[PDB]
Amino acid sequence: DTPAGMMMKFASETTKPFVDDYLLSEDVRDAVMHNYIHIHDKDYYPTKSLTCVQHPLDVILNHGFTAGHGSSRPAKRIETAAVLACISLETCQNEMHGGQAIPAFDFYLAPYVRMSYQEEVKNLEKLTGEDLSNLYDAPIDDYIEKPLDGLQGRERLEQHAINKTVNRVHQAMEAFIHNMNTIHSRVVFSSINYGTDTSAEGRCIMREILQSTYQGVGNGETAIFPIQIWKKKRGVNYLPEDRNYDLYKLACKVTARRFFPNFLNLDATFNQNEKWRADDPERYKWEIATMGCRTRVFEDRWGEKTSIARGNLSFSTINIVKLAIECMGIENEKQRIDMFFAKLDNILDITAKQLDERFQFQKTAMAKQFPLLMKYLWVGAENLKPEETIESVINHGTLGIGFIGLAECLVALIGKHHGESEKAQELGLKIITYMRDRANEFSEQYHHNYSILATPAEGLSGKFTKKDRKQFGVIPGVTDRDYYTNSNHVPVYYKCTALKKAQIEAPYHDLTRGGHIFYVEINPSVIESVVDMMDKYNMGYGSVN
Amino acid sequence: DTPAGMMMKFASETTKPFVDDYLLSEDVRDAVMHNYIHIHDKDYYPTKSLTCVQHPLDVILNHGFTAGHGSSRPAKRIETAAVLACISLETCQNEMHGGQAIPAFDFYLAPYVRMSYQEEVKNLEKLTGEDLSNLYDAPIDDYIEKPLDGLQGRERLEQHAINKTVNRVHQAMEAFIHNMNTIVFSSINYGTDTSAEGRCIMREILQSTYQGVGNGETAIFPIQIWKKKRGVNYLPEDRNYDLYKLACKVTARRFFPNFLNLDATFNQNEKWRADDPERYKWEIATMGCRTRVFEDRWGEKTSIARGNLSFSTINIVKLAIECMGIENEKQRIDMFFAKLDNILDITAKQLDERFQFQKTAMAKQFPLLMKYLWVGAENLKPEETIESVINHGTLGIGFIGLAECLVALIGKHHGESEKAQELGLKIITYMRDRANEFSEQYHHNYSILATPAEGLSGKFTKKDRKQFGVIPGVTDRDYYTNSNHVPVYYKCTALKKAQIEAPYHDLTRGGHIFYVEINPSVIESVVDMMDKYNMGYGSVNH
Ligand SMILES: Nc1ncnc2c1ncn2[C@H]1C[C@H](O)[C@@H](COP(=O)(O)OP(=O)(O)OP(=O)(O)O)O1
Ligand SMILES: Nc1ncnc2c1ncn2[C@H]1C[C@H](O)[C@@H](COP(=O)(O)OP(=O)(O)OP(=O)(O)O)O1
Ligand SMILES: [Mg+2]
Ligand SMILES: [Mg+2]
């Protein structure tokens, strides 16, 4: 009952009705309280804050950041760069409502491990002066630790300069884990992605944080934050011959007891670009990155295909279960199936209209309303004055239309869900491709970017399930198992193996360009099998615990 | 503009009317909107949160903290200890509505300066394997720095390690400054720790607040206070005289740090010494909000694990103006003291009635506060109505606007009159007497306070000008003067200003300050004038 929590609760309670009655449209707000649609993070509407953004740390580290009197200076070393990343994630969280994301953590923090290594290199000569000025440009395969027992030369001290460097970076990453875990406010949902940087700095960063989320906080308590995602790329870390196969095995072993990190698939046929090369200094631009809230921002109709500096403005969830339940009553299956798609066409248009309306509201903004947000992070910054109505900056944005509850939808007209019938598994794929088609059509119409999303249901776990009992109730197999199932998942109350669930739920990921997950409830052998199933049936994102 | 600012503004706007019409009693809610009193931090009433506390870092450093899921192990080095102090300040800021202060800031990090020095004391024998099992207990005078040009023998490992810790204990204070300067009302006081491990925390913080933040820009936070004592740092022969001169020189261009005086009649104890490891408990410490917590009618005289629960300000100007009209001076002077007793009783009743709601609390409503940082902790279950702990708090009755009250019946403020100074040193001693009487009656601790006017500067002056009319020298010269200061619109020297504003400090046991507006010669002279009489707290800035 922390007082800061009460202040946040009061703010939310005094803001949400004002948002509903003063900042929305009648048509959309009619469905926002009719269990058809659910606007996410509604309490932050009057503030022109955006949901999530992938922070480009290059500008905030080469240059500084200014917010009020907070005049900072460019970073110098690892113990300042990691803390600056924490400060940026915290400060931006005060100017945004969703979760903060660091795409290619290794790519961002690679140079400030090399700089710290140089700083240490120019310190070991103070004991015994020597002209070692060639360690600024000495290639190193990786930064490893070992006992300093047995050596009779500068090798005893050349490796020691990394021995303290790896410990310094390890303590920095442990502080990063704790600092993102010491939730004392009325809570920051930071997510980091890594796995595709083939350098000594990147691999040291990726190895000294996976071994720190396995030790645990406190006396051995499993940490809750940050959410960690591993990027799997063919030719990089998947095959045994690949470069980062060992880190993939380490991630599997850590997930075997702490249920982290999650896994992301860059070999998906919808996560590819035409400018990715193994030698590109900035290849991380053309690579999809996600967060713990299952958010994807990759393509751009009016911009270069990238994820950096972009993000999501807002999104909302659609309760297809209500439509499916309302579709009952009629006898023939063809008529009910046809009527289900009619109820899905208008709601997609309503959601796209809501997203465009929030786009209208969020424009005519100020660069000084959210410091450090529309000044160094978003794509359009550095070109418009602190008050000159930033409008050439918000075009490169994305919008989401979410859905939840496929199992109870697949039991409303045929009687069996997609775990006991093959007819059901064919109807399930139809009600997602149509959503994708209508999303593309609405993006052509309203002149923006739209996508289809499988919401995590972390704040929608039971609201729709409980409130559906208004015009009906006690329906066997649907309104008898407490929470609604996940977006497109096989019900937990149905006994199933791993292979069958993987085959059933896989095809729904290419259609969902906003986000998705494959969830399995229980040695890294099991995690390896789950990742193999995820890769084989072209899935993408997957979690096991 | 900022979403975080807008959420806090909405929370304040939705919480203040609820406090006004539901929680507070009608007797003292009548005076809060009548421009007679102002309850500070009215917004954080419904949450059981005390105003300010001095942080006993020893318990949250020797043992960790388990606020929420954040299970933390004990600290090990200066970086970890300083970041943990910052985290503790930030966490308690989410559970208290006032300002966080570190009592004897140099006292609470010296052991982890020593331990950090021990970090490299074995990281330097790694290259040169040697049995150095004595530098853990090697006495040192100060942690000095100098160019490393010329040295041989067993000193490039046993003395450079002592010398390399300068840049480790340093930039830790800089991260502390910037972290407190980046969007927290943090206060640090130091000056009376004679060890090298304590003086290293004092030199590196004055130097870091002189360089400033950014590209040579003056910093705003944290507020820094220097504790001056006879036998420690005042006389030229004293131990920390050089650091006092350095603080004056830094204040000569950055207007920081402030100055606190332990050489006062009201800032003494009977168990203090020069060798007690815990002697800092008997040393008074303050914040930037002028808060004093030293006296305890049912407890030991201490300041460490205590703080203020609530306080409110009075408007003596309204009483003085309502006392006008009559001709004779004696009758109006008597009526002014008549109108001051009832409001003192009302304020004491308010400070007890707010104590009533802060009573019957639960230790789980604010972790790390009523489980680690307070007097009486470690004896109470997470929900079993902690009540044998909140009896060690303090309650404050504040006042401001002495110049306007010194021109309502006499006509000339204490700067331009000698009959006004005599009347000036009568309306505060009465408040002190009545505060002691109400502390005897209501069975709590009460004190008299001089507010910093950081949230009350014009809130009284505007309505005072709009209520009756335009009155020369009273409600026609923009902002009011400070608590008991010489008016700004008057050409006065420093000696006369000190002679006028000196006697009041012994009367106000809650807070007070001496303000001067512009080489460290001027600051040194201001501190000399502070020591010449009984001042306690003072600062000179332009
Ligand atoms: N804990 C912190 N919170 C917020 N900002 C911080 C923190 N620590 C450091 N900073 C920022 C703000 C300062 O303006 C900036 C100083 O730059 P920094 O990365 O420390 O190296 P530098 O270039 O100043 O090197 P040096 O001080 O060694 O010359 O760092
Ligand atoms: N940046 C931070 N923010 C919040 N808490 C932190 C931060 N850094 C460290 N902590 C806290 C939480 C950790 O459990 C605790 C451990 O601190 P520290 O003394 O460095 O570790 P330790 O006692 O485990 O020793 P070591 O890791 O060197 O073996 O400090
Ligand atoms: Mg550790
Ligand atoms: Mg610096």
Residue numbers in the entry:
A (entry chain B): 120 to 305, 310 to 645, 652 to 674
B (entry chain A): 120 to 302, 311 to 645, 652 to 675
The authors write:
RNRs produce all four deoxyribonucleotides and are the only enzymes providing de novo building blocks for DNA replication and repair in all free-living organisms. Class III RNRs, which only function anaerobically, are dimers of an α subunit (NrdD) with a stable radical close to the active site, and binding sites for allosteric nucleotides. Binding of ATP activates RNR, and binding of dATP inhibits it. Here, we present structural, biochemical, and biophysical studies on the ATP-cone-containing NrdD from the human pathogen Prevotella copri, showing that the binding of dATP causes increased flexibility of the C-terminal glycyl radical-bearing domain, as well as a flap-like loop that binds across the top of the active site in the active form.
To investigate whether substrate had any allosteric effect on the conformations of the ATP-cone, flap, and GRD, we determined separate cryo-EM structures of tetrameric and dimeric PcNrdD, from the same grid, in the presence of 0.5 mM dATP and 0.5 mM CTP, achieving a resolution of 2.6 Å from 1,105,348 particles before post-processing for the tetramer and 2.6 Å from 1,132,695 particles for the dimer. Both forms were almost identical to those seen in the presence of dATP alone, and no CTP could be seen bound to the active site. In both forms, the C-terminal GRD is highly mobile in all monomers such that it cannot be seen in the cryo-EM reconstructions. Furthermore, the GRD is mobile in all complexes with dATP in the a-site, whether dimeric or tetrameric. Since both the ATP-cone and the GRD are disordered in the dATP-bound dimers, the exact molecular mechanism by which dATP induces disorder of the GRD remains somewhat elusive.
